[PDB]
Each structure stands twice: as C-alpha cells, then as structure tokens.
C-alpha cells in the first residue's frame, strides 16, 4: 500500500470522528418544562434511540449534556460539579430559552442568565420549549459539528 502521512491521518481521523458521533450517550438535566420534550424526543414518534442516542447513561460515563430548563443559583454549583465529572470528550448542548439567556426569567434574581455562564455550550437550541423535533435537529447538527473535527490532522501538523 501507499499513502502520505497527511492522508492516513485523515482516514483514521475520519473513523473516530464517526464513532464519536454515531454513538452519543447524552446525560439529561430535566430541570423544567423543556424536560418534557426531551422525553418526547425519546418517545415512539421520533425514537432518538434509532440514531444510537441511548436513553439513560451514568453521568460519569456520559457523552453530552443537554441542559434542559432553568438554572437556579441554588442548582448552579451542582451543574458545574457534574460537568467536571464528565470524561472527555464532553459536548454541552443548551436546550430551551431559559437555559440560554434566562428566557422568561432573565430578570430573576435567583436565575443564572444563561447556562453558558456556568459551562461552555456547544449547540444552542431555541424555543421554549423546543419542539421535540427541533431538539432532534440539534443532536443531528451536533453530530455534523463533530464530523467537522480534525484532531489528528492538527496533531500531525504540530
């Protein structure tokens, strides 16, 4: 066989970028109304599991966190704690409008104005609640966002 160093990296890099997106195990934070849609997205109609996205995973063996609902100041420390326990790679997805900018409760003293303050978010899903189909678009969108990752190529060019 024959191939340059760059080429072999891409193909074996393309593999992992496919494995790490064909099998996502999302931790779920059912904090508020938008938690319900997350259940529908797993319900029979859409069956998020049909894409490999399992329903339940140990928070310490997750693959992506979907912050769903409001993020109270009291509950904020717990969220950050959970975030640090996630093994890498860890992708955080903000779901809804209270998990993005405080939504309806932007001006509430006890509401964290956007979960992005507590952690770095990857995908932002609008809509309070985001229809169970829209949320599924974000997850599919996330897989592509993974698919546009070139770790090894950048490593080979260090």
């Amino acid at each position: 066989p024959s191939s340059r160093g760059e080429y072999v990296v891409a193909k074996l890099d393309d593999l992992i970028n496919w494995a790490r997106r064909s099998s996502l195990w999302p931790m779920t934070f059912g904090l508020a109304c938008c938690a319900v849609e997350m259940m529908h997205m797993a319900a029979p109609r859409y069956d998020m599991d049909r894409f490999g996205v399992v329903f339940r995973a140990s928070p310490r063996q997750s693959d992506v966190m979907i912050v769903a609902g409001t993020l109270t100041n009291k509950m904020a420390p717990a969220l950050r704690k959970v975030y640090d326990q996630m093994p890498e790679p860890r992708y955080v997805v903000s779901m809804g409008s209270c998990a993005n900018g405080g939504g309806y409760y932007h001006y509430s003293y006890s509401v964290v104005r956007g979960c992005d303050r507590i952690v770095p978010v990857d995908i932002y899903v609008p809509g309070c609640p985001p229809t169970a189909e829209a949320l599924l678009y974000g997850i599919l969108q996330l897989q592509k966002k993974i698919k546009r990752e070139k770790r090894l190529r950048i490593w080979y060019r260090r």
Binding site: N100, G114, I123, P126, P130, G138
Partner: peptide, 12 residues
C-alpha cells in the same frame, strides 16, 4: 421554521 439552532449565543 424551527430548525435554527446555532453554535454560538450571539447568532441567536
């Protein structure tokens, strides 16, 4: 339309 999820807060 509802499929307008973005990768950054500013986009929204």
């Amino acid at each position: 339309n509802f499929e307008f999820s973005t990768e950054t807060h500013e986009e929204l």
